[PDB]
Nucleic acid binder design. Structure first.
Ligand SMILES: [Mg+2]
Ligand SMILES: [Zn+2]
Ligand SMILES: [Zn+2]
Lengths: 73, 1358, 156, 99
RNA sequence: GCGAUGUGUG
DNA sequence: TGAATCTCTTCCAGCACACATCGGGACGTACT
DNA sequence: AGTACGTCCCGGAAGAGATTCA
């Protein structure tokens, strides 16, 4: 359901941190359960993650926050 | 797991520690059974089992019994991997020279020993003898002797003597040599001696030695005592289909070595005679030599029938060694390849893929989803499922594909585009469908080209593709700013036909509200496609701060044009498409569309472009027929007239009015003129012939002849090609590069007569053949460049410095060639540029320069800008961001780590193909002759004169008597732009302070004569002239006149050979003309070998040239051109006849004019002047004794030596020189290449340096090491109180900077192996990775991108 | 097989063509080939072919005229030494049949219908070299020998 | 012609070349250059480590695939290991180190 | 289940 | 005497395919 | 009878002569 990554870069300047962030999130949403944060479209984890990103609510900050939190828990 | 790789020599005991036994029997296998022979190359109890966890005797076929060795056959039991890990050795019963250390040029052994390699050889292969501590004798230690010499010596000294011959000898030599007395004595020798080659040899020696001692090594180790053997697997005995075995060469080599060693063993115990044992040892040494490097020592030994068998060296080096064969690239699973086609129904973010092909590709994923849905318990069952190819399978396949990008590649993978990605859509057939646009990016027509596909297997990589490889994300080549989604032939023909007015057609000039209803008319056919028409339209201009204002209005346009308009995205202005939409047009169209509305709309717009294009193109049907190429009626007439002209010139020749040479030349020129006339005729009668009524009477208009359409479109072909279809095809050139005196009369429509076609044949075959060799040499260039930059990545954010280079736009006096805008764009300020209004901040000092600031500059018309460049960033082990500027394809600044190295490399490379092979380079020579004749000022400004001592001529003009005049061009502010030299006594067409415009000539003179200009007026006598004796009278036929040639000493008559003739201006009767202001008359003494025309008794005006001096000149740069010129630049080949420059600045003077390179002394204004320099007198000069010149200034004339440039002018200077030259080449062929790339190349081109003073350092003085290392060192060292070091950057050609790099494995993997590995091995050069090629080899991540994040985290952790 | 003698006006014209090409036509064709090679990049592309061929020709000619500007020797002499017809002379010659023939003699690199189109290294010239108003000039064309009478000598 | 997972050469545990031999494509030096030019890293690391060289990791990959765990573990390129043993056969010592 | 040489394709 | 200028001789010449052939002979025997 | 099994094997560029202004 996704054709480009432009707004993704717009939300994260590196364009590579983009990559790694997406990847971490993706491994989560494929192995670590933890259902996504957006109506899926039979799309794979990958696109799911990029879409979560351009919904401006997932990044490296949020990730490490939630990891530390769940780890405390 | 690990880190930096270490390398060193081989201690015999270290080897023993490696091995697990020693072969003794040369036999390979049983080949009666297939069991390996005991204690041989394949022996288990040395090496190990055949099949996993199975003894040879057949004892323990059981994991439970692992670990323990046998006792019957006595063999360990494990995985067969051990059969690969282990290694074996051989106790050679005699020492052996290691041929690498023996023959590398230089021989490490030799230099260590100070001995001619030839004689060291003569030692090794046993035809000599060498002393070993002979004692109180008449003989020297290193001394060597022959047979009879040795025998007489033996009889001269029976026992106390000591010498030997061969391996043992060399070994004892080295073991005897102490490595500290050497340091002492040789440093003393360098201190004392003076000879230059001595210095160089001795310094190489001392380098070798001090390094060797710094390591923990031992020289004798250079001699092998226990030669290891390769593990067996890697030399496997291939069982061919038959009772034979196509043995690997390694096997046979080891076999020979073993037989040899065994005969040697069996001999010694039997005390066989010395001649025999010598022959034995000799064969042994040669065999070991073969083992290591067959083919390096004399005749190689062959293998099967006649071809030299492969060796270990071979297995490393060469195009097909391990490096170039399996590590810098390799074969790869999960892939495929096919032929390609078009399928224009594909939103370019996708591409075709063959169904069968896919189903075979993703089989893993298939099995996965299969047993997820649970349709097969075991994997095997699913394998059967896929093979049966049942229904459910395909649905699952679609499922797994739906969003999983794949990679496409073409073969000639030239540049970054060369691999892209898509999302497949599954198609019938068996080929790959591929979007049309992306063709040109692939440089890939559909002539049958094969493309390959890869599939990322992992999730991260799926992201990789979708982020950095999905053609969407590449509209711009990182090479240069042009778009790369340019439409092409079909689609553009379409649009052309789709927007072009005729004068009169169905639906003429009606009115239409909605482009919708326009398309309605067209589909109805109730109104012609292209027709003049008034229509309402609506457009959107977004002047507001990110907000779109809608307006709407009526337009006088064409129906189809609107119909196109219904697809323009909401943004652009309407006027973009009012015109005819040529290729260039639609190019700008798409491009502006991008730059104004971002990316997503751009791509969707591109695909809509293609759709609508193909559509109306077909709907039109632009065919081509023979009648569609009109032969110009006047063609027959014109060529007949030309024939008559040829006859006229032929009559002139036959009547002897001209020689065959100018005959040839006249004929060719007149044919050329005729050709051009014909071209004009045909182009006219095509482009305009369409002439039709209008509801009036007539009118001419642009045509519709499909061929002219296809051209003016810009689809393919142009005036040129349509010419070679209709008019004559001009002239053709024989292989001589000459050009035949009879052109092609006819064209392709008519038939060529044989001889013509035959000529044009070789005419074209020349280039058609050229392209091959061209491709080859180009590729070599590319590779070399990549391995000079494979280890440079932007790492830190901001160096934070205040250095850089200047930029001025190049001008030919009139218009500018390089718009400073288009040279600076994308790069970043160095200082703050002051307003033209002096002392006013126009732009900040450390900020980007994008298009709007460029426009501001243009508005303010800035002369030059100081700007940062990668050349000199202060980064360590990398390059700071802001110094690199806009990564193209991404308007914003570079991202933290996108490794510019490789992209720059490619970008330089790719145009390779597109150069020419072999011509003469011209660039600097053009302006060269220009400035010779007369001065050319650049721009508008006033005039300033330095050292102006002159005199007004009779005409009122001015000519200069001071030999030191400088011309300064004044701006509208008060500084100076140009400071030109001034030849002596030039005809000044101007004067000081005169406000003149840009691009004008101000002076004039004979470019090749030292004038003898007067000083006063009055009559002329032969004052001091010696008649006949010194002078000579020379009557010249062609000029029908004589003159007075001034003969120099060796040429004038000997009588008064020292009597000097002169000339003094006199009054009306011969008295002295005292110079106004001085007391001496104006006598001028005449230098020899000159020419004088005027004779005695002539009135002359103040400021007249008297005599002339023939000034020799030669500009033979005739080894220069194109691709090889690029090569030689990045190579820094000292050109054939360099031009010398000023060592230091100051006053100059002559010296003792010894024949040959006479002398030239220099002296600083105050500093010491210990310097002189000898210069070949036969070479011309550009200076005189009284001159005072700047350092690094031109002295001789000719090509400009990069090395001396560096060591004199400056880094900025040299990088500017390189970039100007290379840009000149590529422009002379016209391929836009942003400078940044060449810049970074140069940066690597100077990554080493040498020393002058260590101060408090950790460095030997006469030493070479990278710039970065010393800079980081002395940085902290100066941070402490102690004093730093003095260095000197030294430029290296790429094919060198490669070699001496910090790392080695790269070099090892570049252009040669043995040299590098050996020098390392003696260096003990412990080596980190810190580099792409390195990690590629070891296969961990790459510190480039994503991997740059990885390495940052890791280095942070430790 | 060559003679560097040059007339002033011709040298001027040489500089003129040099600038015209290396300053105007070269940059035009430059822009042209650039736009043509905006990633067209086809060896078969005969547009690119012909364009680069014009490049090759203009380059050959510029190098030729460059070497010329280097070597060529100017003699722009006055009408002072007259009578002899050594060079740079408007000359008429006549034949038995009365073949009037007028021309000025200039340097090899000036042979055009522009001003005056007779060489100096030509055999005719070689004969004409040093003669007077009434001499009997003879040459030996590859068709044989022939002769003419001088009728005019003029300078400028 | 295509290939997923088939034979493997014997000297170097690498895929074979050609169609007749049921082998796969060749990712070439220039293509390595290319991927390097793109920031794409995991791509090339996967495409040199898993897809070719380690038998161990190759198997790990194939299994993890069949369980959807899109993942990889590099290990070491067995070919480079071969280079090591080869140079070591030459009179040169070469080693890895600690970390 | 290797390497040589050749032919052809881009 | 020694710093320049010839002159043998090692090293490299694009990428990716496809297909094809061919791969020791020689010298001498205990037998087959 | 005749042999399948034995051994047996053009450009560059940089170095070491080598030649010539001292
Ligand atoms: Mg093709
Ligand atoms: Zn056993
Ligand atoms: Zn910097």
């Amino acid at each position: 359901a996704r054709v480009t990554v432009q707004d993704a870069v717009e939300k994260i300047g590196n364009r590579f941190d983009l990559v790694l962030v997406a990847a971490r999130r993706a491994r989560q949403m494929q192995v670590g359960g933890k259902d996504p944060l957006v109506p899926e479209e039979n799309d794979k984890t990958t696109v799911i993650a990029l879409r979560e990103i351009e919904e401006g609510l997932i990044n490296n900050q949020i990730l490490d926050v939630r990891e530390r939190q769940e780890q405390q828990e | 797991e690990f880190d930096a790789i270490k390398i060193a020599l081989a201690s015999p005991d270290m080897i023993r520690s490696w091995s697990f036994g020693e072969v003794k029997k040369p036999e390979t296998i049983n080949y009666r059974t297939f069991k390996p022979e005991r204690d041989g190359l394949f022996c288990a109890r040395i090496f190990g089992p055949v099949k996993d966890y199975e003894c040879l005797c057949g004892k323990y076929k059981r994991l439970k019994h692992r670990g323990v060795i046998c006792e019957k056959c006595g063999v360990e039991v494990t995985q067969t991997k051990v059969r690969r890990e282990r290694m074996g050795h051989i106790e050679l019963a005699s020492p052996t020279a290691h041929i690498w250390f023996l023959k590398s040029l230089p021989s490490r052994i030799g230099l260590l020993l100070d001995m001619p390699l030839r004689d060291i050889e003569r030692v090794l292969y046993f035809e000599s003898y060498v002393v070993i501590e002979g004692g109180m004798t008449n003989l020297e230690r290193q001394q060597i002797l022959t047979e009879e010499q040795y025998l007489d010596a033996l009889e001269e000294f029976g026992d106390e003597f000591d010498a030997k011959m061969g391996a043992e000898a060399i070994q004892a030599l080295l073991k005897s040599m102490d490595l500290e007395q050497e340091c002492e004595q040789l440093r003393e020798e360098l201190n004392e001696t003076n000879s230059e080659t001595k210095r160089k040899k001795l310094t190489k020696r001392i380098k070798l030695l001090e390094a060797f001692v710094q390591s923990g090594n031992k020289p004798e180790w250079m001699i092998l005592t226990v030669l290891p053997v390769l593990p067996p697997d890697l030399r496997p005995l291939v069982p061919l289909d038959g009772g034979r075995f196509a043995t690997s060469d390694l096997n046979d080599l080891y076999r020979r070595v073993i037989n040899r060693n065994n005969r040697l063993k069996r001999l010694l115990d039997l005390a066989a005679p010395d001649i025999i044992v010598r022959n034995e040892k000799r064969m042994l040494q040669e065999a070991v030599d073969a083992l290591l490097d067959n083919g390096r020592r004399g005749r190689a030994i062959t293998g099967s029938n006649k071809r030299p068998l492969k060796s270990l060296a071979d297995m490393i080096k060469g195009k097909q060694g391990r490096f170039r064969q399996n590590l810098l690239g390799k074969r790869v699973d999960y892939s495929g390849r096919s032929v390609i086609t078009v399928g224009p129904y594909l939103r370019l973010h996708q591409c075709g893929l063959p169904k069968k092909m896919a189903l075979e590709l993703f089989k893993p994923f298939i099995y996965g989803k299969l047993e997820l849905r649970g349709l097969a318990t075991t994997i095997k069952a699913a394998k059967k499922m896929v093979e049966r190819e049942e229904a459910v399978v395909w649905d699952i396949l679609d499922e797994v594909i739906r969003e999983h990008p794949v990679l496409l590649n073409r073969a000639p993978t030239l540049h970054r585009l060369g691999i892209q990605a898509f999302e497949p859509v599954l198609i019938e057939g068996k080929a790959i469908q591929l979007h049309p646009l992306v063709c040109a990016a692939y440089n890939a027509d559909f002539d049958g080209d094969q493309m390959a596909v890869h599939v990322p297997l992992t999730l991260e990589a799926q992201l990789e593709a979708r982020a950095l490889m999905m053609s969407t994300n590449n509209i711009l080549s990182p090479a240069n700013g042009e778009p790369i989604i340019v439409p092409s032939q079909d689609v553009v023909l379409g649009l052309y036909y789709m927007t072009r007015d005729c004068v009169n057609a169905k639906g003429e000039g009606m009115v239409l509200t909605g482009p919708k209803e326009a398309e309605r008319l067209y589909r109805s056919g109730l109104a012609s496609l292209h027709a003049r028409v008034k229509v309402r339209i609506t457009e959107y201009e977004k002047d507001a701060n990110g907000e779109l204002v809608a307006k709407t209005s009526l337009k006088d346009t064409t129906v189809g044009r609107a119909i196109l308009w219904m697809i323009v995205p909401k943004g652009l202005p309407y006027s973009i498409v009012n015109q005819a939409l040529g290729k260039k047009a639609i190019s700008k169209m798409l491009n502006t569309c991008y730059r104004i509305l971002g990316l997503k709309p751009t791509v969707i717009f591109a695909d809509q472009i293609m759709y609508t294009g193909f559509a109306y193109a077909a709907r039109s049907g632009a065919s081509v027929g023979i009648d569609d190429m009109v032969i110009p009626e006047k063609k027959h007439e014109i060529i007949s007239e030309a024939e008559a002209e040829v006859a006229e010139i032929q009559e002139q020749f036959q009547s002897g009015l001209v020689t065959a040479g100018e005959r040839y030349n006249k004929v060719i020129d007149i044919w050329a003129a005729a050709n051009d006339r014909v071209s004009k005729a045909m182009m006219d009668n095509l482009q305009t012939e369409t002439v039709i009524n209008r509801d009036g009477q007539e009118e001419k208009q642009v045509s519709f002849n499909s061929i002219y359409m296809m051209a003016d479109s810009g689809a393919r072909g142009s005036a040129a090609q349509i010419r070679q279809l209709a008019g004559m095809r001009g002239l053709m050139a024989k292989p001589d590069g000459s050009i035949i005196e009879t052109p092609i009369t006819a064209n392709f429509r008519e038939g060529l007569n044989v001889l013509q076609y035959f000529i044009s044949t070789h005419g074209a075959r020349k280039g058609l053949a050229d392209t091959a060799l061209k491709t080859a040499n180009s590729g070599y260039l590319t590779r070399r460049l990549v391995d000079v930059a494979q280890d440079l990545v932007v790492t830190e954010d901001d160096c934070g410095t205040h250095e850089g280079i200047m930029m001025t736009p190049v001008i030919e006096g009139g218009d500018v060639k390089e718009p400073l805008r288009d040279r600076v764009l994308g790069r970043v300020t160095a200082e703050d540029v002051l307003k033209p209004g002096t002392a006013d901040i126009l732009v900040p000092r450390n900020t980007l320069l994008h298009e709007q600031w460029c426009d501001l500059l243009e508005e303010n018309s800035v002369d030059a800008v100081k700007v940062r460049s990668v050349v000199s960033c202060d980064t360590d082990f990398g390059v700071c961001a802001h110094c690199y500027g806009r990564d193209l394809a991404r308007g914003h600044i570079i991202n933290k780590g996108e490794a510019i190295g490789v992209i720059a490399a490619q970008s330089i490379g790719e145009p390779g193909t597109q150069l020419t092979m072999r011509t003469f380079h011209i660039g600097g020579a053009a302006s060269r002759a220009a400035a010779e004749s007369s001065i050319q000022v650049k721009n508008k400004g006033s005039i300033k004169l330095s050292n102006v001592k002159s005199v007004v001529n009779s005409s009122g003009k001015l000519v200069i008597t001071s030999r030191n005049t400088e011309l300064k061009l004044i701006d509208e502010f008060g500084r100076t732009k140009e400071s030109y030299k001034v030849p002596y006594g030039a005809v000044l067409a101007k004067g000081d302070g005169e406000q003149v415009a840009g691009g004008e000539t101000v002076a004039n003179w004979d470019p090749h004569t030292m004038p003898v200009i007067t000083e006063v007026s009055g009559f002329v006598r032969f004052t001091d002239m010696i008649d006949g004796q010194t002078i000579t009278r020379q009557t010249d036929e062609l000029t029908g006149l004589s003159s007075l040639v001034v003969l120099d000493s060796a040429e004038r008559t000997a009588g008064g050979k020292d009597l000097r003739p002169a000339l003094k201006i006199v009054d009306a009767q011969g008295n002295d003309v005292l110079i106004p202001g001085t007391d001496m008359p104006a006598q001028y003494f005449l230098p020899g070998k000159a020419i004088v025309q005027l004779e005695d008794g002539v009135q002359i005006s103040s400021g007249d040239t008297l005599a002339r001096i023939p000034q020799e000149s030669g500009g033979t740069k005739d080894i220069t051109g194109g691709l090889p010129r690029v090569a030689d630049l990045f190579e820094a080949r000292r050109p054939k006849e360099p031009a010398i420059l000023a060592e230091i600045s100051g006053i100059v003077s002559f010296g003792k004019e010894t024949k040959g390179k006479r002398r030239l002394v220099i002296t600083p204004v105050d500093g010491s002047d210990p310097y002189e320099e000898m210069i070949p007198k036969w070479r011309q000069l550009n200076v005189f004794e009284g001159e005072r010149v700047e350092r690094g200034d031109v002295i001789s004339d000719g090509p400009e030596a990069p090395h001396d440039i560096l060591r004199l002018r400056g880094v900025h200077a040299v990088t500017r020189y390189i970039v100007n030259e290379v840009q000149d080449v590529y422009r002379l062929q016209g391929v836009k290449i942003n400078d940044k790339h060449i810049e970074v190349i140069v940066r690597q081109m100077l990554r080493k340096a040498t020393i002058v003073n260590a101060g408090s350092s950790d460095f030997l003085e006469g030493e070479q090491v990278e710039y970065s290392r010393v800079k980081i060192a002395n940085r902290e060292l100066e941070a402490n109180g102690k004093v730093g070091a003095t260095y000197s950057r030294d430029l290296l050609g790429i094919t060198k900077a490669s070699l001496a790099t910090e790392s080695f494995i790269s070099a090892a993997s570049f252009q040669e192996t043995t040299r590098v590995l050996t020098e390392a091995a003696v260096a003990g050069k412990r080596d980190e990775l810190r580099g792409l090629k390195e990690n590629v080899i070891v296969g961990r991540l790459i510190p480039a991108g994503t991997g740059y994040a990885y390495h940052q985290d890791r280095m942070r952790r430790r | 097989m060559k003679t560097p003698l040059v007339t002033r006006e011709g040298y001027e014209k040489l500089k003129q063509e040099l600038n015209y090409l290396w300053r105007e036509e070269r940059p035009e064709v430059t822009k042209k080939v650039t736009w043509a090679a905006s990633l067209g990049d086809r060896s078969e592309n005969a547009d690119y072919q012909y364009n680069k061929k014009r490049l090759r020709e203009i380059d050959r000619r510029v190098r030729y005229l460059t070497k010329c500007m280097e070597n060529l020797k100017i003699v722009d002499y006055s009408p002072q030494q007259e009578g002899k017809v050594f060079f740079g002379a408007w000359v008429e010659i006549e034949n038995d049949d009365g073949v009037t023939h007028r021309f000025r003699i200039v340097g090899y690199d000036e042979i055009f219908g522009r001003k005056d189109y007779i060489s100096i290294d030509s055999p005719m010239a070689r004969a004409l070299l040093k003669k007077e108003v009434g001499d009997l000039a003879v040459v030996n064309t590859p068709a044989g020998e022939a002769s003419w009478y001088v009728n005019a000598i003029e300078y400028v | 012609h295509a290939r997923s997972t088939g034979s493997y050469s014997l000297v170097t545990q690498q895929p074979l070349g050609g169609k007749a031999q049921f082998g796969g494509q060749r990712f070439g030096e220039m293509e390595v250059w290319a991927l390097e030019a793109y920031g794409a890293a995991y791509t090339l690391q996967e495409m040199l480590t898993v897809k070719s060289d380690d038998v161990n990791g190759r198997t790990k990959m194939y299994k993890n695939i069949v369980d959807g765990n899109h993942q990889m573990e590099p290990g070491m390129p067995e070919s480079f290991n071969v280079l090591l043993k080869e140079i070591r056969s030459l009179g040169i010592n070469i080693e890895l180190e600690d970390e």
